[PDB]
Design a binder for this molecule. Sequence first.
Ligand SMILES: Nc1ncnc2c1ncn2[C@@H]1O[C@H](COP(=O)(O)O)[C@@H](O)[C@H]1O
Ligand SMILES: Nc1ncnc2c1ncn2[C@@H]1O[C@H](COP(=O)(O)O)[C@@H](O)[C@H]1O
Ligand SMILES: Nc1ncnc2c1ncn2[C@@H]1O[C@H](COP(=O)(O)O)[C@@H](O)[C@H]1O
Ligand SMILES: Nc1ncnc2c1ncn2[C@@H]1O[C@H](COP(=O)(O)O)[C@@H](O)[C@H]1O
Ligand SMILES: O=P(O)(O)OC[C@@H]1O[C@H](COP(=O)(O)O)[C@@H](O)[C@@H]1O
Ligand SMILES: O=P(O)(O)OC[C@@H]1O[C@H](COP(=O)(O)O)[C@@H](O)[C@@H]1O
Ligand SMILES: O=P(O)(O)OC[C@@H]1O[C@H](COP(=O)(O)O)[C@@H](O)[C@@H]1O
Ligand SMILES: O=P(O)(O)OC[C@@H]1O[C@H](COP(=O)(O)O)[C@@H](O)[C@@H]1O
Ligand SMILES: [Mn+2]
Ligand SMILES: [Mn+2]
Ligand SMILES: [Mn+2]
Ligand SMILES: [Mn+2]
Ligand SMILES: [Mn+2]
Ligand SMILES: [Mn+2]
Ligand SMILES: [Mn+2]
Ligand SMILES: [Mn+2]
Lengths: 317, 317, 317, 317
Amino acid sequence: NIVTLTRFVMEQGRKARGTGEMTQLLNSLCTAVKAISTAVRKAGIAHLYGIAGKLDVLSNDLVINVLKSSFATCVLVTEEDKNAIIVEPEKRGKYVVCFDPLDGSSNIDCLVSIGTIFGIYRKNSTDEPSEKDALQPGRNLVAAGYALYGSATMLVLAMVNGVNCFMLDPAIGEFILVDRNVKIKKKGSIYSINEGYAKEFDPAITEYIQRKKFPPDNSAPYGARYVGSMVADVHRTLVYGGIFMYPANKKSPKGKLRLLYECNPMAYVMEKAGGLATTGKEAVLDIVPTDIHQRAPIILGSPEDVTELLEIYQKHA
Amino acid sequence: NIVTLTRFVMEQGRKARGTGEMTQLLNSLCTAVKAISTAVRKAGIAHLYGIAGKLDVLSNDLVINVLKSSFATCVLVTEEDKNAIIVEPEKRGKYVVCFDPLDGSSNIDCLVSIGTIFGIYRKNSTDEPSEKDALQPGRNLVAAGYALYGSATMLVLAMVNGVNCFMLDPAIGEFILVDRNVKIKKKGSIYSINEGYAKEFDPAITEYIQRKKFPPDNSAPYGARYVGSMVADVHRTLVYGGIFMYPANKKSPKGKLRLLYECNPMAYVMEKAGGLATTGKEAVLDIVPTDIHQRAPIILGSPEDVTELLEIYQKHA
Amino acid sequence: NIVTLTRFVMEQGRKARGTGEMTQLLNSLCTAVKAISTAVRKAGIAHLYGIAGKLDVLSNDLVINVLKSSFATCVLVTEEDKNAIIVEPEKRGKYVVCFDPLDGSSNIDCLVSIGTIFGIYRKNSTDEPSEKDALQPGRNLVAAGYALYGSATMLVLAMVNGVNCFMLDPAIGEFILVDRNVKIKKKGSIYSINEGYAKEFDPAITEYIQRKKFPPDNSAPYGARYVGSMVADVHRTLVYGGIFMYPANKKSPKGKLRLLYECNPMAYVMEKAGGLATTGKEAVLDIVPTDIHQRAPIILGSPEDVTELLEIYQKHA
Amino acid sequence: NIVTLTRFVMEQGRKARGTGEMTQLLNSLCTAVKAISTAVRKAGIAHLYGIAGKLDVLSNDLVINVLKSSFATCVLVTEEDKNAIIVEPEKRGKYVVCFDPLDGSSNIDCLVSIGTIFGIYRKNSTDEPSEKDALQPGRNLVAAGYALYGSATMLVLAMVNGVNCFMLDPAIGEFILVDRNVKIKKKGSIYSINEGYAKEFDPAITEYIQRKKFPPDNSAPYGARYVGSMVADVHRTLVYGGIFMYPANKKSPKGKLRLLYECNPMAYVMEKAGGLATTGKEAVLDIVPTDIHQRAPIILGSPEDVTELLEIYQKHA
Ligand SMILES: Nc1ncnc2c1ncn2[C@@H]1O[C@H](COP(=O)(O)O)[C@@H](O)[C@H]1O
Ligand SMILES: Nc1ncnc2c1ncn2[C@@H]1O[C@H](COP(=O)(O)O)[C@@H](O)[C@H]1O
Ligand SMILES: Nc1ncnc2c1ncn2[C@@H]1O[C@H](COP(=O)(O)O)[C@@H](O)[C@H]1O
Ligand SMILES: Nc1ncnc2c1ncn2[C@@H]1O[C@H](COP(=O)(O)O)[C@@H](O)[C@H]1O
Ligand SMILES: O=P(O)(O)OC[C@@H]1O[C@H](COP(=O)(O)O)[C@@H](O)[C@@H]1O
Ligand SMILES: O=P(O)(O)OC[C@@H]1O[C@H](COP(=O)(O)O)[C@@H](O)[C@@H]1O
Ligand SMILES: O=P(O)(O)OC[C@@H]1O[C@H](COP(=O)(O)O)[C@@H](O)[C@@H]1O
Ligand SMILES: O=P(O)(O)OC[C@@H]1O[C@H](COP(=O)(O)O)[C@@H](O)[C@@H]1O
Ligand SMILES: [Mn+2]
Ligand SMILES: [Mn+2]
Ligand SMILES: [Mn+2]
Ligand SMILES: [Mn+2]
Ligand SMILES: [Mn+2]
Ligand SMILES: [Mn+2]
Ligand SMILES: [Mn+2]
Ligand SMILES: [Mn+2]
């Protein structure tokens, strides 16, 4: 018998004896993702083309409005907004949601996969809600995941008891559980990084990559993939195995990717799946942010591949 | 004042005073692509999961029957079939069609962008049709193109007059012309290749990659992108500029990509767009096929990038 | 801000301090209705027509499977099944659901509106669950309503605190609250009955109809409508006002419509909206069934119109 | 071996050796109908309800612009426009098109079936086009038909060769031929009329209705059906058999239905189907229009039922 996201979430909220506030939040998210999927796939485009009678701004406006209306949130952090958004008291809940409404927006004109990333924290210090409420390490996440708008739309939800994948059936607007309790392969055979920045890579990265192309024990070199859209690259890593890297380089001395809404949610997802997520020096989830738009270096994926790189880092220290 | 693919195809048939046979064919293609797009985005998956108690194969069958139903074809060549398909004389038209119904199928499980590639030839001769009718150099193509099932579904159609892009509106099931008489940039800033095969590259490719990461004239390095699905990588090249490469290596000294249904269609779109498509030695479109599943090395993209690499190929001549 | 059925149901379950069992049931129903809507609209019909690679049986199979999987039901009564269906102990809940999966199936070949009708009872006598558990008067309903597959799909849900209408947006597969706390007009101007049975009508009905065509006080006669699909006819009555009638006649000495899954749910809906629902002699909801497939006469709609007919009945008694 | 409307229309244009102008027109119609169908079923309604912070009018604009974009028309007559629309000479074709973009609009709020009706004429003359070009008797129609937005969406197209029915597959946006060369039953068992106007009927109609409820030869009475939307009532008549009537009464001694865009198209479909369409005195198709919004009484359906009523009309002659 089939399991829909709505049923699964509700069930999980029942086993946890929640008051149903988080459950409403997750149902709001799902509704928002479906709406974003529909806009991404271009339904109604004929209307802009005058059969007479933006995508990231709309996406932002959908997430914020849909999340507010859930009455389960108090603080919102968007990649798109400079300051955190404080929900009006009438609509307040106890949750802080950190999200990237549409990641990979550059890739839009090229029709490359894009996705939505979100991390959910529970408000701790019960003072008037504010930005500080979002400044929590990723180890403190209640839930995190992402929606990938690729050849099909998928929602990956990670919580304390594991990672689950839900495929969207757009005929009936419902997410079906298709992969339960996901676990990443211990060792993979694909490395993903933008080698265009080779000139700026630190030594450890340089050695690792070359070890991938020319393995000492003449084994098969790793295949390479780099879609340029984090959600797509990280999703392939989780599903097929391997390692994804967006280390520090001159243009981004602290990495390009943001900690709260890109790095943390993906780090959380990887850990629950049995993978590692490091900065090179430390675990991503343990870092305590000081700025909501803070950036951080990130390397994640199969435990053996990440460990192997971490050993190399240590060797140059 | 909107243009649908159906309107466009018909006006073009009228301008060229065709009997309407090629128009029937293009319309059958449009229908097949819409049907594939729907299965790719998983409409109906709830039924496989028991809500009421392959893909490569399904795509092949759709294209074949829809093409036969057009009464415009005599010989069909598919990546999925060992032997060419000779059409029943009852439905025999004059066109030969070579296609890859679902390219990048190994990416399906990862939900990476995938697509359909086709090239159409007019039968040249007057004897019983056979495989031999498909063995024409790409320069003899009447039409060629592809459909990309990415964040949105797109059909790119190349004919003698040029290249046009049609975006699928899944709400009304109509391809809408969105980019007219497309021309690739003279020079791009992205290079695309599986650097996992570094150990195997010939000296010319190696030197080029090097120039891209460490520019000898102190110009900015190129960014790297490699989705792993030709239609996705090529479509990004066409729209954004740059170069895509899949040269020879232990993976056949002859390349991996197939000439008839992958290389030729793309080479044809590139040339009509004002770009180049070469094997490093000769232009892809001039190669005389000798086997329907013949492979060939290919390099395509912005003219200045392709000429640059060709120069290196010559330096090592 | 928008209100989706999922949010509304959850919210209502929260205010009622339910354990979330009914909430899951209602979410199961909604999922089933969306799936039935999609099949009714004919998505995928191209596949039966061989682009190479029942509606009431499928509908039945969807409702039963989806309801079972909710783990909130113990007894199921379908217009389509001879005996009540007892859910396996592992999947048991405390609810008894009486439904017509696809009412108006004759009207299918003519593409006339069809709908789904359901009534929900709470199991009372805690003995092993059985048919007897369904034999409860309609006054004992916890929830009832219907889905109408007309020009657009709508779900009308009635519960103790009122009647609400939700319109299905098939782009995102979500029901949006479009009409809150529905109340029927006190007096209408449309009568709905199949006058083809005039030869068999009892005297009261005969007098009423003629009073509608030739009003004593020369006022405007009532307009007449009779779609032949109860859900459509009753839905127009609720929304626009008037009276619907399916009285007893020779072919159906006790009416055609069934009490448990057609009459009761519609009677419940009408009462909460401020309308009346009578057999001519008694209120529909007060009747205690003795057979699950029992039939009953029914007259419902605006309070003044129904009262006016009831007066006439009394006059001939 | 499936037939889409697009394939059918093209083969028919080829058999008739047309220049492709009428084919472009029919294809533009197919596109408009699909666009209307989508708005009717409310795709996108969530946006009107603020998810991210008319119908008659929208339908008119769609048909008009899509028709003008076809370059096959010179004069357009709409139920919604006081004066006929003369096409800009730049896009002027040779066809005159009369249509009701959304018939039964008063039923919209009740979600009752609704539809689009069109009749196409070839311009006969050689002077500046004008309203006068549309004033042709229905016997001069090149094509006529309708689309019904009911439980499923259907397009019925009538041309010289006969009547065909195409079911819309909303998953791929394609009309699929499902009923070929349709013929109405010689005699039906359903009569359709608004009996609310009994007081106003002429003696002949009154006598007929009477014969249907109380058959003088002791045969079974006819059942009654009256949806209240012409396209719905007529489509049921065509498929199931019977008679539909909207005769004269205080609601204009001249009938309610409009000749050019409601009566003629339907009369034309009926005749091609082997049925009859009369005003009681003369055949609808032979009436010489004298005003574009001229109304006319109509009776259509199975030949034996229409002849029967015509006989009564004569008895009172
Ligand atoms: N649907 C759910 N899925 C998983 N955990 C849940 C769910 N609902 C509530 N919980 C857990 O219970 C806590 C409080 O729930 P709540 O009362 O809804 O705010 C949450 O923070 C989670 O720890
Ligand atoms: N829709 C079309 N678009 C562009 N060229 C066409 C079209 N139809 C026919 N032609 C051209 O005219 C030739 C013969 O058309 P046909 O008679 O249909 O086989 C083709 O092979 C093309 O070169
Ligand atoms: N979603 C809901 N909407 C309205 N009433 C509810 C809801 N959930 C529960 N209730 C009410 O509370 C009772 C018990 O709920 P439950 O524990 O879920 O079985 C039901 O029978 C209703 O009376
Ligand atoms: N697709 C078509 N189906 C049936 N008849 C057509 C079609 N196209 C053209 N014809 C017929 O041929 C005439 C002229 O076609 P046209 O040149 O397109 O204006 C029409 O008016 C019809 O009588
Ligand atoms: O367009 P965004 O939202 O800023 O995302 C781009 C990000 O950019 C990374 C790739 O950037 P580079 O071009 O530097 O490789 C991805 O991995 C992220 O999706
Ligand atoms: O033959 P397939 O399974 O359709 O593979 C697709 C091709 O595979 C190439 C990638 O091959 P590598 O893994 O060797 O890079 C892509 O460009 C082409 O799309
Ligand atoms: O086809 P069903 O499920 O038995 O429903 C038909 C019912 O039949 C009534 C009309 O029947 P008559 O033909 O006797 O008028 C409707 O009001 C109900 O929808
Ligand atoms: O003019 P409209 O609003 O499009 O009305 C539709 C017409 O209205 C007739 C019903 O009229 P009565 O209420 O007079 O029966 C139907 O057959 C026709 O569809
Ligand atoms: Mn963003
Ligand atoms: Mn981002
Ligand atoms: Mn393939
Ligand atoms: Mn391939
Ligand atoms: Mn039924
Ligand atoms: Mn029924
Ligand atoms: Mn109208
Ligand atoms: Mn009208």
